[PDB]
Ligand binder design. Sequence first.
Ligand code: DVD
Length: 263
Amino acid sequence: EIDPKDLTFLKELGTGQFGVVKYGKWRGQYDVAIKMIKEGSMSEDEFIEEAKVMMNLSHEKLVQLYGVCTKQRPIFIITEYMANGCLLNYLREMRHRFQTQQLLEMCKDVCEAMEYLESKQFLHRDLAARNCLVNDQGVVKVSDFGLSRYVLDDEYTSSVGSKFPVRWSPPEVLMYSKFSSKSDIWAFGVLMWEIYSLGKMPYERFTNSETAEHIAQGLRLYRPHLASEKVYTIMYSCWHEKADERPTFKILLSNILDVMDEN
Ligand SMILES: CN1CCn2nc(Nc3cc(-c4cccc(NC(=O)c5cc6ccccc6s5)c4CO)n[nH]c3=O)cc2C1
């Protein structure tokens, strides 16, 4: 529990699934992001009840959840500030500057974080470039892991809602809501595709339902121009129709390192 008196609000950072987020400082020194949880937007009992485990996830490549303020309303969630914002806009805005080696390093950053979550049997559930953040040195970190579990918004929680991450979801999630490590694996493959396409939208011009139909018929995202064959083999392995044929993040990390070694 963070003492809200130790927080200094400084700047608006926009809005997310739980409402307003601000930039501020903790005890005058540490840059933080502060979510102000819109009333009615979150399953608050469930979150507070299970919030300890989320604070104890600690890894360089995870956006740290520093703590919470729950003695007043709205509740606050206080997290590690990342000066370059979310990965999707960072890709699109710096599109013409990236070398392929840097793209691979971004995939490695994310894969390390997910290997850690995997080892803790903790699911992200909404992995995507929009839910990765980039710090002032260009390091990518995975953000908002596990929070989808607390979203109260039928458009987000229903597989046919307008906000559900259909384009990051494997068949068993779209058909049966079967989340597992292997559905995070699928989403990581799509995230690699976002990185190597420099921030394009997956299945652009397809609706969500057409996307679902597409992928249920075996069809997959094309290889982006900047992805080598080896890289594409790695992201494609994430999209096996059968979940148990998909790799683990440990294997994916080994693959990425192997490609780095070869280069
Ligand atoms: C000039 N730029 C302006 C944008 N800009 N942004 C920066 N940096 C951060 C943004 C956020 C942030 C802000 C608003 C919303 C959200 N996203 C969410 O709240 C949620 C995502 C999800 C996903 C699934 C389930 C529930 C939720 S709730 C975040 C990231 O958490 N945070 N931290 C940061 O450092 C730095 C900049 C400079």
